[PDB]
From Swiss-Prot, chain A:
This is Pre-mRNA-splicing factor 8. Present with 468 molecules/cell in log phase SD medium. The MPN (JAB/Mov34) domain has structural similarity with deubiquitinating enzymes, but lacks the residues that would bind the catalytic metal ion. Contains a region with structural similarity to reverse transcriptase, presenting the classical thumb, fingers and palm architecture, but lacks enzyme activity, since the essential metal-binding residues are not conserved. It is found in: Nucleus. The chain holds residues 1063 to 1110 of 2413 of the full protein. Component of the U4/U6-U5 tri-snRNP complex composed of the U4, U6 and U5 snRNAs and at least PRP3, PRP4, PRP6, PRP8, PRP18, PRP31, PRP38, SNU13, SNU23, SNU66, SNU114, SPP381, SMB1, SMD1, SMD2, SMD3, SMX2, SMX3, LSM2, LSM3, LSM4, LSM5, LSM6, LSM7, LSM8, BRR2 and DIB1. Functions as a scaffold that mediates the ordered assembly of spliceosomal proteins and snRNAs. Required for association of BRR2 with the spliceosomal U5 snRNP, and the subsequent assembly of the U4/U6-U5 tri-snRNP complex. Functions as a scaffold that positions spliceosomal U2, U5 and U6 snRNAs at splice sites on pre-mRNA substrates, so that splicing can occur. Interacts with both the 5' and the 3' splice site, as well as the branch region. Has a role in branch site-3' splice site selection. Associates with the branch site-3' splice 3'-exon region. Also has a role in cell cycle.
UniProtKB/Swiss-Prot annotation, chain C:
The lineage of its organism: Eukaryota, Fungi, Dikarya, Ascomycota, Saccharomycotina. This is Pre-mRNA-processing factor 31. The chain holds residues 39 to 71 of 494 of the full protein. Belongs to the PRP31 family. Interacts with the snRNP via the Nop domain. It comes from the Eukaryota. Component of the U4/U6-U5 tri-snRNP complex composed of the U4, U6 and U5 snRNAs and at least PRP3, PRP4, PRP6, PRP8, PRP18, PRP31, PRP38, SNU13, SNU23, SNU66, SNU114, SPP381, SMB1, SMD1, SMD2, SMD3, SMX2, SMX3, LSM2, LSM3, LSM4, LSM5, LSM6, LSM7, LSM8, BRR2 and DIB1. Promotes the association of the U4/U6.U5 tri-snRNP particle with pre-spliceosomes to form the mature spliceosomal complex. It is found in: Nucleus. Present with 1260 molecules/cell in log phase SD medium.
Length: 48, 48, 28, 70
């Protein structure tokens, strides 16, 4: 993401880039297991 | 280990997009205005 | 104690004078 | 670091190492300085002697005040 927020500020005003960058952290839950998503992309998002 | 990109590699990657978008003479995407023509026509296509 | 409160006296008026800076003299 | 004429030659990896070593930073901050350095920062005109004197005088008293607060 540290590369994405920049590459997006190239293509898009920063408020949308920041939304798109922070929207991918979230927290991920499957039953018992939970992890914050720091690294990969979540491709289940409409804009992914 | 932190991010694996490292600054010297991020440099080479970022110059490529900068030069591509400048060579293409590309205007960045703005933020959707409060008063906008196609808002309705974007909501529809989204919601359906 | 008196030498130290004397250095303090110049320090408070000095800093409050520095907050008025909105420069070489105040620099030195 | 960024106004220093010695690093300004070009293609010097010294910049990243004096960033990390001199003014304490983390990688995530170095990357931002690289990409924002490209987008915003401009090496075309070096600064006038006036603003260099002013800048050095400010860095002096800020570094010194920080040392006193510490």
């Amino acid at each position: 993401f540290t590369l994405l927020n920049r590459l997006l500020r190239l293509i898009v005003d920063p408020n949308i880039a920041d939304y798109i960058t922070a929207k991918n952290n979230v927290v991920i839950n499957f039953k018992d297991m939970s992890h914050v998503n720091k690294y990969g992309l979540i491709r289940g998002l409409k804009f992914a | 280990n932190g991010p694996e990109i490292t600054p010297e590699e991020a440099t080479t990657i970022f110059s490529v997009m900068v030069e591509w978008l400048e060579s293409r003479s590309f205007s960045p995407i703005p933020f959707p205005p409060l008063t906008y023509k196609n808002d309705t026509k974007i909501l529809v296509l989204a919601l359906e | 104690e008196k030498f130290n409160p004397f250095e303090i006296l110049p320090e408070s008026i000095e800093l409050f004078r520095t907050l008025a800076l909105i420069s070489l003299s105040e620099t030195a | 670091i960024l106004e220093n004429e010695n690093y300004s030659k070009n293609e010097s990896d010294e910049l990243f190492f004096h960033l990390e070593n001199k003014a304490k930073l983390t990688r995530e901050q170095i990357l931002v300085l690289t990409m924002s350095m490209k987008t915003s920062f401009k090496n075309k005109e070096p600064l006038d002697i006036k603003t260099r004197t002013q800048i050095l005088e400010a860095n002096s008293i800020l570094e010194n005040l920080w040392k006193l607060q510490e």
